[PDB]
Structure formats: C-alpha cells, structure tokens
Design a protein around this nucleic acid. Structure first.
Lengths: 323, 318, 323, 318
DNA sequence: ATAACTCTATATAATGTGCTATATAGAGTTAT
DNA sequence: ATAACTCTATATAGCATACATTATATAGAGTTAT
DNA sequence: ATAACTCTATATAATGTGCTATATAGAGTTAT
DNA sequence: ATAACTCTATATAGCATACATTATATAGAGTTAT
C-alpha cells in the first residue's frame, strides 16, 4: 500500500495545521529518536514492527526515562501509523503487554510524577522583602512579574501576551486586566483580572521605569538590557523561556546555585506561583470553585494534586481518629 | 453492494420515527446543501468522496459558518453514509484532518460557541412584578410559561409537550409536572417536576382563564388570539417559534427593541431560564449534584460553562 | 447448523437450572406467543427473521402492550437464539431501529411505568380502626399480616417463609424475627426484624387463635377456612397469590369493588406496604440509608421513585424560589 | 494455528511481569489442578474441550469448593485460552450455563462470600491501651502496623511495600505516606495517605527503636527476632503471612485461642481494619464519597456490604 | 386589517440490559 | 567580553476534542379568526 | 532449642488516551 | 354450593451477575540467628 501511504502523508502535510506546532515538534522528535535507534539496531523504522517497537520501549525504560515519556513515544508512533494507514503499534499484543509491564515495573521502583515547586505567599513576601527597595530596572520589572504571576495565577503565556491597553484602574486605584485564558470554542472568550494595593504598586513602578506606557499596543513586559535599559515593543513579547528565567533566576537569589543534581522542579518554574496561590487560597479555606476558577482550571483532579500535603485535606479518617 | 445501501437507507426511512424530527430536518437540510454544491461543481453527491467532502467543508468555512454548523454538515454526511452501511467521510484523513484544521483555525481567530442571555431570579421577579397585574389572557399565559421555564429548567420543546392530564399535586398543594421525553431521555419513567407555591398559582390562573382543563389530554399551553380568546388543542402544540417569542417579547418589554446588529442572543430566548436558573443555583450554593437533578443533566459539563470573586486581593490585603 | 443447534438446545436442557423457573416460564410464554403469531402470519418461528420479528414487535405495540413488555419479548427471543447459536434479533438494524422508534413513540403518548399503591400509616391505622375488634379468625390473621408487612417492609415471600421458631421477644415483650432477604453470595445471609407494641399485639392474637405455635417447624401464616378455622403446616406456606389477596381483599373492604376498569395497581398489591412505610419513613425525615436498608433495597434509584411526589423531595429550585 | 498459540503464550511468558505475581501463581495453580484432572480421566488439557471443562467445574463443586474458587478456576482457564488467541471455555454454552447453575445451586443452599472480622476504633483503642506500654520491639512494630492499617485502610500487601523514603510530613507534623501501586491502581501518581498525630507517634516510635531509617530505601516494616533485634532490608519485605499473623496474634491477645472449627475469619486478618474502618466511617456519618477516598475505592459497591436501627418501631410507637 | 400565531429554512448550541420478580385475571381444588 | 536574551530539542506534566444525534435561534413567508 | 519468621500451596474474596503544554539544559544572538 | 384457596399464564416492575484480573486466608513445611 505504498501509493495509499503516499496519499496519506500528503494528506498529513496538506492539512498540517490540524495539529499544534508543539505536537509536530514532538512527533518529529520521537521519529528522529526511533529512527536513530532503528539505524543503530538495523531495523526498518517505517512501518514499525511490533517486535522492534517493543525492544525500543524497553530501551527507553533502560534509558531510565519516565513512563509518561515512553507513552509519548508510543503515542507518536501510533499516530504516525494511524495517519498513514498502517496498523498502530499499540494494537499489537507484544506492545500492549510490554507497556503494561514497564508501567507496573516503574511505578514499583518509585516512579513519581513531579509538579511545580510552590511559590507561595511566604516566598512572595520574602522576595518582596528583598527587592521592593532596589532601583534596578530588571529588579523592579521582575518584582512586578512575580506580583502579577502570584496574584492572578495567570499562565506565563498570558502574562507575556499582556499589553498596556489591557490594564484598568479600580477601587482606590486598584488595577484590572482584560485577559484570555482559553483555547476557545465552548469556553470563555476572556476573563478580566484585578490586583491588590501591593502588586498594583509594584507594577506601577515597572510602568514608570519601563516607560512602556508610551505605545499602548505595547506589552506590559519587555526585555531589560545589561545597561538596565528597557525596550518596549507592541510586536514582540518576552519569550516564555525568559519568564521561566525570572522564576529560576529568582529561586537562585534566595537559595543559590542549581541544586541536588538530576533535575526537574529544583527551583521555581513558570507554574510555581499558580501552584503556590492555590494552596494559600486553600489554606485560608477559600473554595474549590473559587479556586479552580481563580486559576482557570476546569477539571479539579489537578488542583487537588496541589493541595494534597496540606492539613486541611487530611481525610475523614484522621478527623474520626482525632474525635 | 449498492443493493444493501438501497436497502439500508430504505430501512432507515421506514422507521424514520426512531429519530427526532429535527434529526431528519437537518439530515435533509444538509443533503440539500451538499447535493447543491455537488451539482454546481459537477460532483457525485453519493456516495461522497472524501476529497469532495473536504472541499465542501472548506467552502462552508469560507462562507463564514460557525465551527458548529460545519460540524453539523459533516455529522449528517457521516450518518447518511454510516447508516447506509458505507464508510464515513470522517473515516478518511482528508476529512478528519480538515475538520480539526477548520476548528483550530476558527477558534484561533476568536470564535466561541455562544450561549443564551441568562434569565435569572431578579429578571423573573421584575417581569412578574410588572405582568402580575395584567388581566390579559396572553399576559397570564406568558407569565405562567416564564415561571415554569425558570422553575423547572425544562426546555421549551418539552414545556410545549405538557398536556393537562400531566399535572398533579404534592400534598402541600404544589403543582407536579410529569415529564416523559427529553433531549437526553425517552422512557416510560420520565420525571416529575415540582413547581413552587408561587409558580403553581401562576399556572392555576392560566389554566383557569384559558379553559385548557376542558380536556385532560389538551396541551397545557396554546395560542391566545387578539381578542384574548385562547385556543386549546389536544393535537396541536403552541409552536416552538411562539415559545421563543415569549422570551424576546418579555425582554422587549423591560429593555425595549433589540440592536440593529443581527447578532444572536440580544434578548432572552428559549434557553435563557435554563442557563440563568443554573447559576442562580450556583450562587445560592446549591450542590452540583442538586444543580444536576434540576436541569435533568446526567454528566456535569454544560453546567460548568453556564456560569464561568476577589479571593486573591483579599488574601494579599491581609 | 442444525446439528450445532441441536447440541445447543441439549446444552440448554441439560443445565436448565442455570435459570430461575420464572425465567423459563416467561421464555415459554414468549415463544408460544411468537409461534402462534408466526403461524397465523405464515412465518417460520425458528430461527426468527429480522423482518418477521420486527412485524411482531409492531403487532405487540398495536396490541397496546407496554414498552417494557415488548422488551421482554425481544429479550426472550434474543436469548433463545443466543442460546442455540443463532444470530440475535437485536443485532439486526431493522429490529434495533424499530424498538427505538416504538419506544419513543410510546413514551410520547403517555406510557407510564406504574408502581404499587402506597399502603401508608394512614391506611394501617384505618384498617386497624376497622378490624382490631373482630373475633373473626381470618380477620385477626389478616390484621397481623398487614402489621408485619407494614412494620418490617419484608417481601411477601419473606412473610410467607416465616416460621414460629423464627420469632423472639425483646424490650417490654416486643417481638423479633430472624429472616433472609437475599438471593445470596456477596450479600447478607439473614437480617433479624423487630416489631412494635402495636403489631406485636396483633400477631399475638394470630398466634393465640391459629394455635400455630404448636409445631414450631410451623409457619406463622397459614390458611383459614370458611368455618373460620386455621390450618397449621410446617411443610406448606401461604401462596404468594393469597398474600396478594389479603392486600386486595383489604382495599376492597375500605374502597369496595374493583375500580376504574383497565387494571394495574388499582388496589394494594403485595408491595404496597413497602412503598408505604418508605414514604412515611421519608416523611419523618429518616435517612435514605436508614430506609434503603429498612427495606433491603440496595440501589436507591427505586426508593426515590417512591418518595417523589413528596414535599420533602421537591428540589433545590423550589427551595430557592421560596427563599 | 498451533503456531500462533505457541507464540501467543510464549509472548505472554516473556512479559509475565505485566501481571501480578499472584495472577501467575493462580494461573499455574489452576492449570496444575486441571491438568491433573485431565491426566486422571484421560483428557487433553489444552486446548480445553468445553465438555471436559464442564465436568471439571462440576467436580470442583462436588469437592465442595466455594462458588468463588470454582469461578477462579474457570477464569484462569479462560485467560490461558483467550490470551493464547483461542476461544474461551466460557465461550461455550456447556460452560457458561454450568457455571450459572453451580452458583445458583450453591447460593440457593446458603453459601455466602464471607468478609473479614471487623477491626474498628474500639478494637484499636483497646489493643493500643494494652500494647502502648510494651517496650518490646515486636510490640512497638505491631502496634504501628495496626495503626496504619486502620488509619490508612491500605491493604497489607501495600503497607509491606512502604519504604522509609516514602514518608513525609504535613506542616502540622502528621506523617504522610506515599502510595505507588495498589490492587486497583498502578501509576506514577499514586496516593499520599495521612496518619493521625497519634498514629504518627506510634510510627515514629517504631522507626526509632528499629533503625529502619538507616537506609531511606529500606522498607518501613521488617522482621524482629526473638532477641528483639529488628532486621531491616531494602530488598526483602516483611512477609504477607507475617502481616496476617500480626492480626491474628493481636486478636489472640484479647480473646485468646481460636475455635477448633477450622473456619475462616475466626480472628482478625489482613482485611479486618479495612472493613471496620469502612463502617466506623459510616457510623460517624462520613460521606460515601469520603468513605471512598478513604479506602481508595473508585466505584461504590464493596463499601456497601461491609456494613449491612428501629426506625419503624419508632414511627409506630408515636 | 391585523394580532398573534405557524411554517420553513438555514444556522448553531448542547448532551448522553438480561434475568427474576410481581400483578392480576382466570381456572381449578377442597372442605365446609 | 558578557548580560540578557531567543531558539532548539527533548523530557514530562497537563489538558480537551471527536461521535452521534437532538435541540435551539430566528428571520421570513404564510394563516386565520377576528 | 526456638521465636519469629518465609515459603508454598490451595482456597476464596474483591474491584476497576491522544494532543498540547511546560521544564530545562544547551546553543545561538545582540547590544553593551 | 361456596369461601378460601392454589395454580397458570401473561403483563410488567424490579433487580444482579459476568469479565478479567489482583488480592487475601491460612495451614504446613522449611529457615536462621540466636
């Protein structure tokens, strides 16, 4: 079915906007890896043979990769074949059995899904107690950022996407922000966010120095060069990669040099403040709805994963036992 | 074989009644639209060719239609085919992928599935405070309808199906409405919707002045002519466009005539009370399970967007 | 596949205790009906042809039978074929479509599932206010019955199955009864039931007159002949059919002669007292667990169908509206 | 072909690890029992003949085995076959129907699936009031185990899998136990079970006197010898028969030696605390949803029989 | 002449069984 | 030269559409008892 | 010699993805 | 003769196992550091 398959991949290329760029990136990434392994192991990479895919999955595990990562591989390989008319590796008894086995084997060696390191009020006040005083342009900007981040629980991409026009001024000069936190359709279109007398002051400065207010198609956050000189733009926002940096560079300021070699959530990442505001909100007995919403989350099983080591969430059994 | 297909479809038309009348209306509406696009481009309408279907869908999207209508067209084309015993247009990559792309391209340019303007307690109470005083038959009917809509959360289509024989009472004197079929259920079990003492009265007055109780099998709701005379029927229902107009009329009453925009949902509509009651209940702190039994829902997902605090500014301001 | 089918039905006959006698009865009943219709309509009854089964289902509906009844037919026909190696009528597009259609059509003409006519406290006191005084042996017995029935919510079959040994004597001479209300395995084995100072007195008499206490392998309830003379037995209980009669004969005493011609729950049936005690228990805000259990019910959707026209159960919306 | 079958099964043995070790133990235990019955009656053990399988099942039932064991045999025989790529013995009327008949015949003669004797709060409190005072290592271990069992509702198999590295604290100073795999779940997500301040102490004392914290990857629980010396290990777990004996020993302590009957559940067992805690929670009025999060259950059915009032005598006595 | 529909069309939003018992009218059975 | 990014590519955590109907939304054109 | 296991066996009870983003170390890019 | 059933057969309301594992229950036989 070479002509069938040819037609299929042309279909795939013609309507490639059917998937997100990130999806294609991961697809490409898995194929390069699978292909490179087939080459090294003398195997045909396309179509993929059950037995070869199985050996690979084990090679992935022996590489000490996580279950969820091995899934992404299988997943990408399955889609490739499903999208080129060939049988999916998953629908093979040897790949179904081995994934199952590897899954069980890994969870039984302590495979732990990780999450972001909480950036809670305790850290906000702390970093605040360390920078509200500096005249450093990148220090005032970075303070605003973690101010917005923490206050609003907005996704990093949403903080970047922001523009000066998107900012209002409420009760006692408080601030508000017309946003958009939904990959649309049956959801919301936007949401509007408000600040506190605290982070409203922090941002004020950013505005004051950045001088960004000058061209309102401008974005609130912009790069700040080594001379401590900002650089507005209405056509370019700060890279997610940078926002992640403000978080990491900040953990370092307080905790210093990368830690316990090995990686993954060693410092605060872009989701830390959301993971942080959540617990705090839960720690003041707020509401899961007030929260779930407060962060735009739609299907709770995640928020809960965040507030799980908290005493509020201990469980009916501990309640009973402490009569 | 073209022979089963002639049969499979003939077999479908034989028991058309297994499907909503509105399912047929859309199937034929779609086939019409499609066959017309095929006739224009010199293409075979059936069986559909994946590439033809894909050009059609892109044509729709170019016509500026909603992602939801475009999907409606595809789903009808998929039912025709599948129930024919053939393979679904969606069964091919050209179609599968193009759809995703149209959605993605549309919803990444804004587009959102809208929802009706909410009709909540405050709205009810205001309309009632004004209409309560009318001795007009239309007014008494409309008010009773608006109360049931909001009280029960029933869909218009379902309220129009209420026959007099369907009402009963709790011992407390509250009206009970038996509900057979619904968008989400068709059983001899059905539901029993309880009205408030206030809404029960509103209904009682409507029955009284209308005479719909003359025949138990008469529909609860009917037309009332310019001379104020009702027009009860056991065979014909008050029309779906009528039930819709009660909602826009009422809204016209309080806020006046609607925009020149030609947009949808500029006033209340058949779904307004369902959406609004849904959240009045959220606000009231009702339990999602309860909010669910209200709107007869069986999952917990529409409930969810119908109502998407200052919790953080409060935590920060100490 | 005549030899295959022959083998299949021999299988069916060999292990026929695989199903309850009632099941076989209904099977036999449906086949007789289906067969008689095929004869009258010149059709082969076995195997059943989609088109013929479909015509039948419609004939069933035009007979004005209920949806649930038509299901029982299809159901029995499906099992026959499934249990003789032939295709099930259900797996045919014409029988799937027509059942669906007939279902919808019937629910849209007012097809109402019925249930038992409640035998609530109000009726107990009433009938009690009318018989506690009679010296009639069948009147004292019948009073005990509705006493047990109502108090315990036991299934009719359970009341019949009772034996004198199965009765104890608690706080202030109250009575108790070791029962069994489960078609076993992962359930209970028995349950023990207690009476009130009321129905404990009522039953006492039964015991006194019936003279049943004389041979404890005896059953509490026994037949009472026209001379008003009881007849004990340790090997024969009162027929469910009789117990149903005590209920019906009783409604008549209060409401007289069968009613509104047409049938189904016109008087109290064997389930009336359970349907009755339930609402009463719910009307005193008892508990669904206290109840569901009180009647042995395991999966709530039914108890609720019983307490649905009650003001307690009105719904969050009426609560809100009455602020 | 006999050729796929040789492969399908070879393929299963290759990745035996996809299944619980206990799944293999039973598969082989069953095949043993079956093959032995086949050898005795001059029958082919594989592939199984429906009629042979049916005689086997009736043989088991004649041996007086439980409906549940008989089903275990059939289910193992069905897995062998199905995972072989062949048809299941259960796939034939002879087998399907005989099973139903054995159940029906058995459960209509009494037979009930038993459940462990309950170990509730009162039982915990009593055992603790007595054992609390022991300075003995065994006693300190057993008490800490019994507390976790009851607190967490975890299965023994799962508690035996707790490694020191797995414990953490709430800020309140309560022990948190991370739970990877369970009878009902195998994910890198797993659960975090919180102990009470009281049970945390009990655990702390056990860790302290045992030295299991010498190696984070050491299992929480281990053997303690006659001389009171523990025996921590990162490779070997305290045995399932040991965990079971803690329960019977404890019970022996309070009520003395068990009947001569040879029946099951005459004393507490690995499941006792799960059953009892389950109902302590019912009594306490806990919410089934909550009772569910307790015992990690995802449906709502076992919860239900673990605890099967005088409501009517109260309504009647006025 | 018109209020108040109804109809028709396209456009778009919203949502989720198989075995056993029970009810009941009828026919049959016994003892009074 | 580097601070301060922006990109790349991979590891992994975190969602969200697709199916198959069934209904609503609403303007326009026709209907009928006044 | 033995307490306190462990093992082995049969017997029996109990229960429930595919696409997109994010994290992060690295390599590349500009302006200071 | 009938009251008082018991059976039959059908209409219909009301449940509850089967799948495929994965675990527990527990006695007996062996193990090892004391």
């Amino acid at each position: 079915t070479s002509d069938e398959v040819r037609k299929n991949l042309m279909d795939m290329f013609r309507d490639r906007q059917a998937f997100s760029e990130h999806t294609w990136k991961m697809l490409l990434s898995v194929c390069r890896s699978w292909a490179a392994w087939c080459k090294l192991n003398n195997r045909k990479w396309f179509p993929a043979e059950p037995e070869d895919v199985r050996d690979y999955l084990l090679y992935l595990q022996a590489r000490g990769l996580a279950v969820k990562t091995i899934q992404q591989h299988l997943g990408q390989l399955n889609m490739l074949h499903r999208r080129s008319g060939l049988p999916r590796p998953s629908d093979s008894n040897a790949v179904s059995l081995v994934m199952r086995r590897i899954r069980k084997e890994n969870v039984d060696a302590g495979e732990r899904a990780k999450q972001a390191l909480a950036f809670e009020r305790t850290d906000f006040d702390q970093v605040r107690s360390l920078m509200e005083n500096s005249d450093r342009c990148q220090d005032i900007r970075n303070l605003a950022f973690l101010g917005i981040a923490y206050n609003t629980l907005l996704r990093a991409a949403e903080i970047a996407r922001i523009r000066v026009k998107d900012i209002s001024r409420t009760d006692g000069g408080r601030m508000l922000i017309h946003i958009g936190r939904t990959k649309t359709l049956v959801s919301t279109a936007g949401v509007e966010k408000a600040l506190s007398l605290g982070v409203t002051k922090l941002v004020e400065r950013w505005i004051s120095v950045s001088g960004v207010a000058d061209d309102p198609n401008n974005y609130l956050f912009c790069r700040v060069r080594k001379n401590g000189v900002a650089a507005p733009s209405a056509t370019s926002q700060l890279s997610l990669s940078a926002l992640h940096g403000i978080f990491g560079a900040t953990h370092r300021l307080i905790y210093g040099a990368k830690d316990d070699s090995g990686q993954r959530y060693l410092a605060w990442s872009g989701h830390s403040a959301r993971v942080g505001a959540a617990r705090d909100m839960a720690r003041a007995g707020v509401s899961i709805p007030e929260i779930m919403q407060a962060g735009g989350w739609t299907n709770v099983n995640i928020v809960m994963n965040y507030i799980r080591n908290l005493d509020s969430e201990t469980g009916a059994m501990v309640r009973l036992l402490e009569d």
